[PDB]
Design a protein around this ligand. Sequence first.
Ligand SMILES: *C(=O)N1C[C@H](NOS(=O)(=O)O)CC[C@H]1C(=O)NNC(=O)[C@@H]1CCCNC1
Length: 267
Amino acid sequence: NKSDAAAKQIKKLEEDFDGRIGVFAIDTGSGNTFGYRSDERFPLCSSFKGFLAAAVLERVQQKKLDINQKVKYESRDLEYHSPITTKYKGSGMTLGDMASAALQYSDNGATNIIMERFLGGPEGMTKFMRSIGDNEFRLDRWELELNTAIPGDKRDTSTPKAVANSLNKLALGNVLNAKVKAIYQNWLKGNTTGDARIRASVPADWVVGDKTGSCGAYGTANDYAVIWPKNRAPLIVSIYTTRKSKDDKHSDKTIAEASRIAIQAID
Ligand SMILES: *C(=O)N1C[C@H](NOS(=O)(=O)O)CC[C@H]1C(=O)NNC(=O)[C@@H]1CCCNC1
Protein backbone atom coordinates (compact mmCIF):
# COMPACT_ATOMS: atom_id res chain seq x y z
CA ASN A 1 0.00 0.00 0.00
CA LYS A 2 2.76 2.38 1.16
CA SER A 3 5.45 -0.07 -0.04
CA ASP A 4 3.88 0.15 -3.53
CA ALA A 5 3.67 3.96 -3.67
CA ALA A 6 7.30 4.04 -2.36
CA ALA A 7 8.65 1.85 -5.14
CA LYS A 8 6.77 4.26 -7.49
CA GLN A 9 8.45 7.28 -5.92
CA ILE A 10 12.00 5.82 -5.97
CA LYS A 11 11.55 4.86 -9.63
CA LYS A 12 10.49 8.46 -10.50
CA LEU A 13 13.39 9.86 -8.44
CA GLU A 14 15.75 7.49 -10.33
CA GLU A 15 14.46 8.78 -13.68
CA ASP A 16 14.75 12.36 -12.50
CA PHE A 17 18.37 11.68 -11.41
CA ASP A 18 19.19 9.63 -14.54
CA GLY A 19 20.87 6.79 -12.56
CA ARG A 20 20.37 3.81 -10.21
CA ILE A 21 19.12 3.96 -6.62
CA GLY A 22 19.40 1.03 -4.22
CA VAL A 23 17.55 1.14 -0.90
CA PHE A 24 17.07 -1.17 2.06
CA ALA A 25 15.47 0.02 5.32
CA ILE A 26 14.74 -1.91 8.53
CA ASP A 27 12.46 -0.97 11.40
CA THR A 28 14.00 -3.11 14.15
CA GLY A 29 10.76 -3.02 16.16
CA SER A 30 8.01 -4.14 13.75
CA GLY A 31 10.66 -6.19 11.84
CA ASN A 32 9.34 -4.29 8.76
CA THR A 33 11.53 -3.82 5.65
CA PHE A 34 11.51 -1.98 2.31
CA GLY A 35 13.68 -2.71 -0.70
CA TYR A 36 14.33 -1.30 -4.16
CA ARG A 37 17.21 -2.71 -6.20
CA SER A 38 18.25 -4.12 -2.79
CA ASP A 39 20.31 -7.07 -4.09
CA GLU A 40 21.97 -5.11 -6.90
CA ARG A 41 25.67 -4.22 -6.62
CA PHE A 42 26.74 -0.64 -5.93
CA PRO A 43 30.30 0.69 -5.23
CA LEU A 44 31.19 1.09 -1.54
CA CYS A 45 33.41 4.19 -1.89
CA SER A 46 34.28 5.49 1.62
CA SER A 47 31.28 3.72 3.17
CA PHE A 48 33.23 0.50 4.05
CA LYS A 49 35.31 2.63 6.47
CA GLY A 50 32.34 2.31 8.83
CA PHE A 51 32.79 -1.51 8.70
CA LEU A 52 36.56 -0.98 8.99
CA ALA A 53 36.11 0.66 12.39
CA ALA A 54 34.01 -2.25 13.66
CA ALA A 55 36.75 -4.67 12.58
CA VAL A 56 39.34 -2.88 14.68
CA LEU A 57 36.90 -2.84 17.65
CA GLU A 58 36.33 -6.57 17.37
CA ARG A 59 40.09 -7.18 17.53
CA VAL A 60 40.24 -4.79 20.48
CA GLN A 61 37.53 -6.75 22.30
CA GLN A 62 39.44 -10.04 21.79
CA LYS A 63 42.48 -8.22 23.26
CA LYS A 64 44.61 -8.81 20.22
CA LEU A 65 44.92 -5.00 20.03
CA ASP A 66 44.82 -2.22 22.61
CA ILE A 67 42.63 0.74 21.65
CA ASN A 68 45.26 3.08 23.15
CA GLN A 69 48.11 1.60 21.12
CA LYS A 70 50.24 4.34 19.58
CA VAL A 71 50.71 4.00 15.81
CA LYS A 72 53.65 5.94 14.25
CA TYR A 73 53.75 7.02 10.57
CA GLU A 74 55.97 10.15 10.35
CA SER A 75 57.92 8.79 7.32
CA ARG A 76 54.69 8.21 5.30
CA ASP A 77 53.53 10.54 2.50
CA LEU A 78 49.88 10.74 3.51
CA GLU A 79 47.15 9.99 0.96
CA TYR A 80 44.67 12.56 -0.28
CA HIS A 81 41.82 13.33 2.14
CA SER A 82 43.70 12.45 5.30
CA PRO A 83 42.55 15.45 7.43
CA ILE A 84 43.07 14.00 10.91
CA THR A 85 46.26 12.06 10.29
CA THR A 86 47.88 15.15 8.71
CA LYS A 87 47.21 17.04 11.93
CA TYR A 88 48.70 14.31 14.18
CA LYS A 89 51.77 13.32 12.17
CA GLY A 90 55.03 13.11 14.13
CA SER A 91 53.28 12.28 17.40
CA GLY A 92 51.61 8.95 16.83
CA MET A 93 47.91 8.24 17.00
CA THR A 94 46.02 5.71 19.09
CA LEU A 95 44.54 2.76 17.22
CA GLY A 96 41.02 3.80 18.29
CA ASP A 97 41.71 7.38 17.15
CA MET A 98 42.84 6.18 13.71
CA ALA A 99 39.71 3.99 13.36
CA SER A 100 37.29 6.85 14.36
CA ALA A 101 39.16 9.25 12.03
CA ALA A 102 38.63 6.77 9.19
CA LEU A 103 34.93 6.62 10.05
CA GLN A 104 34.06 10.18 11.03
CA TYR A 105 36.25 12.15 8.57
CA SER A 106 36.80 9.40 6.02
CA ASP A 107 40.58 9.77 6.47
CA ASN A 108 42.31 7.64 3.79
CA GLY A 109 45.68 7.68 5.56
CA ALA A 110 43.95 6.10 8.60
CA THR A 111 42.10 3.56 6.44
CA ASN A 112 45.17 2.44 4.52
CA ILE A 113 47.35 2.23 7.61
CA ILE A 114 44.85 0.07 9.49
CA MET A 115 44.47 -2.29 6.56
CA GLU A 116 48.22 -2.57 6.09
CA ARG A 117 49.22 -3.24 9.66
CA PHE A 118 46.26 -4.64 11.57
CA LEU A 119 43.51 -5.97 9.30
CA GLY A 120 45.34 -8.01 6.61
CA GLY A 121 44.51 -5.86 3.55
CA PRO A 122 41.25 -5.68 1.54
CA GLU A 123 41.15 -9.49 1.78
CA GLY A 124 41.20 -9.16 5.58
CA MET A 125 38.38 -6.62 5.49
CA THR A 126 36.42 -9.07 3.31
CA LYS A 127 37.22 -11.95 5.74
CA PHE A 128 35.78 -9.86 8.61
CA MET A 129 32.43 -9.22 6.86
CA ARG A 130 32.12 -12.92 5.94
CA SER A 131 32.71 -13.72 9.63
CA ILE A 132 29.56 -11.78 10.56
CA GLY A 133 27.57 -13.52 7.79
CA ASP A 134 27.85 -10.88 5.04
CA ASN A 135 28.24 -12.82 1.79
CA GLU A 136 27.85 -9.88 -0.59
CA PHE A 137 30.45 -7.33 0.60
CA ARG A 138 33.81 -7.38 -1.11
CA LEU A 139 36.80 -5.08 -0.90
CA ASP A 140 39.36 -5.69 -3.61
CA ARG A 141 41.59 -2.59 -3.79
CA TRP A 142 43.13 0.06 -1.57
CA GLU A 143 42.47 3.78 -1.21
CA LEU A 144 42.16 5.53 -3.50
CA GLU A 145 42.02 3.12 -6.49
CA LEU A 146 38.84 1.57 -4.98
CA ASN A 147 36.77 4.67 -5.94
CA THR A 148 36.81 4.06 -9.72
CA ALA A 149 33.06 3.16 -9.66
CA ILE A 150 33.23 1.65 -13.18
CA PRO A 151 29.76 0.28 -14.18
CA GLY A 152 29.82 -3.53 -14.22
CA ASP A 153 33.02 -3.70 -12.18
CA LYS A 154 32.32 -5.87 -9.12
CA ARG A 155 35.44 -4.91 -7.19
CA ASP A 156 34.75 -2.96 -4.02
CA THR A 157 30.96 -3.38 -4.09
CA SER A 158 28.10 -4.60 -1.88
CA THR A 159 24.29 -4.56 -2.00
CA PRO A 160 22.03 -2.10 -0.10
CA LYS A 161 20.45 -5.02 1.80
CA ALA A 162 23.79 -6.57 2.78
CA VAL A 163 25.09 -3.22 4.05
CA ALA A 164 21.91 -2.71 6.10
CA ASN A 165 22.02 -6.27 7.52
CA SER A 166 25.70 -5.92 8.49
CA LEU A 167 25.15 -2.43 10.04
CA ASN A 168 22.31 -3.98 12.08
CA LYS A 169 24.54 -6.81 13.31
CA LEU A 170 27.37 -4.49 14.35
CA ALA A 171 25.55 -1.49 15.87
CA LEU A 172 22.54 -3.40 17.20
CA GLY A 173 23.31 -7.15 17.28
CA ASN A 174 25.78 -9.18 19.34
CA VAL A 175 29.12 -8.85 17.52
CA LEU A 176 30.49 -6.39 20.15
CA ASN A 177 29.98 -6.36 23.94
CA ALA A 178 28.07 -3.52 25.64
CA LYS A 179 31.22 -1.41 26.03
CA VAL A 180 32.77 -1.64 22.58
CA LYS A 181 29.33 -1.40 20.95
CA ALA A 182 28.72 1.93 22.66
CA ILE A 183 32.13 3.12 21.42
CA TYR A 184 31.21 2.06 17.85
CA GLN A 185 27.83 3.81 18.16
CA ASN A 186 29.43 7.02 19.48
CA TRP A 187 31.81 7.01 16.51
CA LEU A 188 28.83 6.65 14.14
CA LYS A 189 26.92 9.41 15.98
CA GLY A 190 29.90 11.76 15.47
CA ASN A 191 30.26 11.24 11.70
CA THR A 192 30.77 14.73 10.26
CA THR A 193 30.07 14.06 6.61
CA GLY A 194 26.40 13.09 6.28
CA ASP A 195 24.48 16.26 7.22
CA ALA A 196 22.90 16.57 3.75
CA ARG A 197 22.10 12.85 3.38
CA ILE A 198 20.12 10.54 5.72
CA ARG A 199 20.47 13.10 8.54
CA ALA A 200 18.68 15.74 6.41
CA SER A 201 15.65 13.41 6.11
CA VAL A 202 14.83 12.95 9.84
CA PRO A 203 13.53 15.04 12.79
CA ALA A 204 16.43 16.95 14.38
CA ASP A 205 15.50 15.29 17.70
CA TRP A 206 16.26 11.79 16.38
CA VAL A 207 19.80 10.53 17.00
CA VAL A 208 21.54 9.33 13.81
CA GLY A 209 24.80 7.50 13.29
CA ASP A 210 25.96 7.28 9.67
CA LYS A 211 28.84 6.63 7.22
CA THR A 212 29.00 8.25 3.77
CA GLY A 213 30.76 7.46 0.49
CA SER A 214 31.32 9.61 -2.60
CA CYS A 215 33.50 7.89 -5.22
CA GLY A 216 33.75 11.05 -7.38
CA ALA A 217 32.98 9.10 -10.58
CA TYR A 218 29.74 7.97 -12.28
CA GLY A 219 27.98 10.25 -9.74
CA THR A 220 28.31 7.40 -7.20
CA ALA A 221 27.45 8.30 -3.61
CA ASN A 222 25.96 6.61 -0.56
CA ASP A 223 24.96 6.73 3.10
CA TYR A 224 24.00 4.13 5.73
CA ALA A 225 22.59 5.00 9.19
CA VAL A 226 21.31 3.78 12.53
CA ILE A 227 18.48 6.04 13.66
CA TRP A 228 17.19 6.22 17.23
CA PRO A 229 13.66 7.74 17.15
CA LYS A 230 12.45 8.53 20.63
CA ASN A 231 9.57 6.36 22.00
CA ARG A 232 10.35 3.91 19.13
CA ALA A 233 12.99 1.22 18.35
CA PRO A 234 16.07 1.84 16.06
CA LEU A 235 15.80 2.05 12.27
CA ILE A 236 18.43 0.97 9.73
CA VAL A 237 18.62 2.90 6.41
CA SER A 238 20.94 2.00 3.51
CA ILE A 239 21.01 4.27 0.41
CA TYR A 240 23.32 3.61 -2.61
CA THR A 241 23.40 5.46 -5.97
CA THR A 242 25.32 5.38 -9.30
CA ARG A 243 24.84 7.27 -12.58
CA LYS A 244 25.22 6.61 -16.32
CA SER A 245 28.35 8.56 -17.39
CA LYS A 246 31.78 9.08 -15.79
CA ASP A 247 31.37 12.90 -15.58
CA ASP A 248 27.93 12.93 -13.90
CA LYS A 249 27.85 14.51 -10.45
CA HIS A 250 26.51 12.72 -7.36
CA SER A 251 23.37 14.03 -5.66
CA ASP A 252 22.98 14.52 -1.89
CA LYS A 253 19.41 15.73 -2.35
CA THR A 254 18.42 12.44 -4.04
CA ILE A 255 19.81 10.44 -1.14
CA ALA A 256 17.92 12.57 1.39
CA GLU A 257 14.66 12.20 -0.56
CA ALA A 258 15.26 8.46 -1.08
CA SER A 259 15.94 8.20 2.63
CA ARG A 260 12.68 10.03 3.44
CA ILE A 261 10.79 7.71 1.11
CA ALA A 262 12.34 4.64 2.69
CA ILE A 263 11.43 5.76 6.20
CA GLN A 264 7.72 6.42 5.50
CA ALA A 265 7.58 2.94 3.91
CA ILE A 266 8.57 1.42 7.29
CA ASP A 267 6.22 3.33 9.72
C1 LIG B 1 35.25 8.47 0.30
O1 LIG B 1 34.31 8.03 -0.37
N1 LIG B 1 36.02 9.52 -0.04
C2 LIG B 1 36.86 10.25 0.90
C3 LIG B 1 36.20 11.61 1.24
N2 LIG B 1 35.15 11.52 2.29
O2 LIG B 1 34.03 11.04 1.50
S1 LIG B 1 32.63 11.11 2.20
O3 LIG B 1 32.41 12.47 2.68
O4 LIG B 1 32.72 10.09 3.27
O5 LIG B 1 31.68 10.72 1.15
C4 LIG B 1 35.56 12.31 0.03
C5 LIG B 1 35.79 11.65 -1.33
C6 LIG B 1 35.96 10.13 -1.38
C7 LIG B 1 37.20 9.81 -2.18
O6 LIG B 1 38.32 10.04 -1.72
N3 LIG B 1 37.01 9.45 -3.46
N4 LIG B 1 37.77 9.91 -4.53
C8 LIG B 1 38.16 11.20 -4.65
O7 LIG B 1 37.77 12.09 -3.89
C9 LIG B 1 39.01 11.51 -5.87
C10 LIG B 1 39.53 12.97 -5.83
C11 LIG B 1 39.66 13.64 -7.22
C12 LIG B 1 38.37 13.52 -8.03
N5 LIG B 1 37.45 12.46 -7.55
C13 LIG B 1 38.19 11.25 -7.14
